[PDB]
Design a protein around this ligand. Structure first.
Ligand SMILES: Nc1ncnc2c1ncn2[C@@H]1O[C@H](COP(=O)(O)OP(=O)(O)OP(=O)(O)O)[C@@H](O)[C@H]1O
Length: 683
């Protein structure tokens, strides 16, 4: 006889089972180390265990292999070696089986073949294709996660936060990771099939795709580091006219499509957080638990030097040059995986930085490195451990040039490298400070033994000082578009009644330290600091004077130098201010039902003293819309005037979904907004 077979279902109950339902559209997607249904339909005759002998087989790489774990064929039994296939039932003409993949099977697209020998002839042919992803729900996988909610937050959650602003005033920008949005997966696989490791050796690369640590390095680096074939092209000068302001993006989904759609050409402008964000989009898609992290006062781009020196004129103005400033904040991601290539005990959060930084040789990116490693000072652990360490533990010394020879060391108690290291909370919208996962508490013994495995025992504070302290105070929150005051707060806990020189300089900065022109300055050369008192000196920062050179990050750096001629003492104090953007009102009109119209009304009230022209509202959100939505406000919005507009959306998936929006205009760019929306049953 001869086996028939007129069908081959893959079911969607597989999607729900492998937490890949959304990803399950016209092509089965599953997660390794777990079994999936597979019903077979034959015509007339069913399966005859007697005479019929069918064996399965699957290949993945463009150059499969039994030995390279990129190809494997296996018997069909009802017993149970990893790559198995067994009969779970069979009736009428149908024959439902259950295949099982290893918990280390390489990820990618597989071709499922069927070997039928209804005696000696039989027929051998394909059954279909499927995408195997990292399984975080499988204990045997290297990315396993015990906590269910953590699995949700770090793998399935499509919306999220990226922390910006300042350490003294953190700001949470909404982001649409949309890793399960149509096409995004396929663009991810492509992203892998076009990296060096793969072109240099398709088999080798396609094989190693069973390692989260390998895949992580590949993805991370395919974002920027070596744009020989990357996804985003960096740009920091602040002239993005022929592309998209890095601050304008509100989700990786569009950048990825803009990438493939333009024949894999680096997309027009992005920056460290944009890299980290799409990186998170990529890894999450593939199944590796990832979360984007933010670090304030990051000693980035330094060659890794755990010691940085700056030389300033008699105004505290970093006379330096060629020297890199400390970043207001720098972003990278963290990925959850085991490290079967390191002295056990280093499983967990691996820090991956998709931002290239001039290194002790050339220009590439870093990670993955165990965070627990960066905490211990185990700078020898594989994958740029030294950089991530200085990124968080660099030391800084501010020298002030003597207008008559050498420089004099100054006291700058207002700077700290590695501040409020943050990332979104698991299952909530609050922020989670994970600074404790990188550094031991100051003073502690663990901190001393750590700075020792790192030879960073450069920390013997000048707890003596000369009886004075200074810090910059802002009073209250200041908004983008107005004037406001900042203060140089001088404290004098001494019997002496000094006379100083206080130099105050404010300047608009970019998120990475690139100082622009001064937007406010005051210099008092005969400041009287009466005994045991405190003096407060004002600095008026005018809109009219910082509006021209402000970046989309609304950052302005205030600097103050207090000079005491007598004992010849220099006290330095700087602070980065964040000008608050106008809020975006969001109303959800109608009933949030699945596969049903939905309307979103968004308003914004022009905060500037001048009108607003070419105002644009852009909306996105995996679960609320398939495509981005943009509306253009035809006429200008005068100084007082508010802007309002509605956008018809068609939620397709139920559950929770965060709607991210971005407002653009000629004088007010990249102001963000977002709204949590619960989509229920249509009925
Ligand atoms: N850069 C900033 N942008 C907007 N608001 C800020 C900023 N920095 C501080 N604020 C706000 O100012 C108020 C007080 O903050 P904070 O106490 O840190 O500053 P300060 O009180 O002026 O200085 P200090 O507390 O050392 O005397 C809060 O509303 C805080 O959010």
């Amino acid at each position: 006889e001869l086996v028939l077979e007129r069908c081959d279902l893959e079911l969607e109950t597989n999607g729900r089972d492998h937490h890949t339902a959304d990803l399950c559209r016209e092509k089965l997607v599953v997660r390794r180390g777990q079994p999936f249904w597979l019903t077979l339909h034959f015509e007339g005759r069913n399966y005859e265990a007697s005479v019929d002998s069918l064996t399965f087989s699957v290949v993945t790489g463009p150059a499969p292999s039994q030995e390279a774990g990129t190809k494997a064929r296996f018997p069909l039994r009802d017993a149970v070696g990893d790559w198995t296939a067994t009969v779970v039932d069979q009736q009428d003409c149908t024959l439902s089986l259950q295949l099982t993949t290893p918990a280390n099977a390489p990820i990618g697209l597989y071709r499922l073949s069927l070997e039928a020998s209804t005696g000696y002839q039989g027929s051998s042919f394909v059954l279909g294709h499927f995408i195997l992803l990292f399984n975080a729900w499988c204990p045997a996988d290297a990315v396993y996660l015990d906590s269910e909610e953590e699995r949700q937050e770090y793998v399935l959650t499509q919306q999220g936060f990226i922390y910006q602003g300042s350490a003294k005033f953190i700001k949470n920008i909404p982001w649409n990771f949309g890793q399960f949005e149509d096409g995004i997966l396929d663009i991810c696989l492509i992203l892998l099939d076009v990296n060096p490791k793969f072109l240099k050796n398709a088999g080798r690369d396609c094989s190693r795709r069973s390692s989260p640590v390998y895949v992580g390095r590949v993805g991370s680096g395919m974002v920027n580091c070596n744009d020989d074939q990357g996804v985003l092209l960096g740009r920091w000068d602040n002239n993005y006219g022929d592309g998209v302001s890095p601050m304008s993006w509100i989700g990786s989904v569009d950048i990825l499509r803009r990438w493939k759609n333009h024949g894999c050409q680096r997309v027009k402008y992005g920056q460290c957080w944009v890299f980290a964000a799409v990186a998170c989009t990529v890894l999450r898609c593939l199944g590796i638990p990832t979360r984007v992290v933010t670090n304030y006062n990051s000693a980035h781009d330094q060659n890794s030097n755990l010691l940085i020196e700056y030389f300033r004129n008699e105004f505290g103005e970093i006379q330096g040059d060629k020297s890199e400033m400390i970043w207001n904040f720098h972003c990278w991601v963290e990925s959850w995986m085991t490290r079967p290539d390191l002295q056990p005990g280093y499983e967990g959060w691996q820090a991956l930085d998709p931002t290239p930084q001039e290194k002790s040789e050339g220009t590439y990116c870093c990670g993955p490195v165990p965070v627990r490693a960066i905490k211990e000072g185990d700078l020898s652990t594989k994958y740029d451990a030294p950089f991530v360490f200085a990124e968080v533990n660099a030391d800084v010394v501010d020298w002030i040039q003597q207008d008559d020879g050498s420089v004099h060391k100054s006291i700058n108690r207002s700077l700290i490298v590695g501040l409020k290291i943050s990332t979104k909370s698991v299952g909530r919208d609050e922020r989670e400070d994970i600074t404790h996962t990188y550094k031991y508490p100051e003073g502690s013994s663990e901190e001393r033994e750590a700075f020792t495995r790192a030879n960073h025992l450069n920390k013997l504070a000048e707890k003596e000082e000369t009886g004075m302290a200074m810090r910059i105070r802002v009073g209250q929150s200041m908004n983008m578009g107005s004037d406001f005051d900042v203060f140089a707060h001088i404290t004098n806990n001494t019997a002496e009644e000094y006379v100083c020189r206080l130099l105050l300089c404010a300047r608009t900065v970019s998120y990475n330290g690139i100082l622009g022109p001064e937007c406010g300055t005051k210099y008092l050369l005969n400041l009287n600091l009466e005994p045991f008192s405190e003096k407060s000196v004002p600095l008026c920062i005018l809109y009219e004077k910082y509006r021209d050179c402000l970046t989309e990050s609304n950052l302005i750096k205030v600097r103050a130098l207090l000079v005491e001629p007598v004992i010849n003492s220099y006290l330095l104090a700087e602070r980065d201010l964040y000008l608050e953007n106008p809020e975006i009102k969001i109303r959800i009109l109608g009933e949030p039902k699945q596969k049903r119209k939905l309307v979103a009304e968004v308003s914004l009230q022009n905060p500037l003293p001048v009108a607003l022209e070419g105002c644009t509202f852009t909306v996105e959100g995996a679960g609320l819309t398939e495509e981005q939505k943009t509306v253009e406000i035809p006429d200008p919005v005068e100084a007082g005037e508010e802007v309002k507009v509605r956008m018809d959306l068609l939620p397709l998936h139920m559950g929770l979904h965060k709607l991210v929006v971005n407002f653009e205009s000629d004088k007010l760019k990249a102001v963000k907004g977002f709204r949590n929306v619960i989509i229920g049953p249509a009925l």
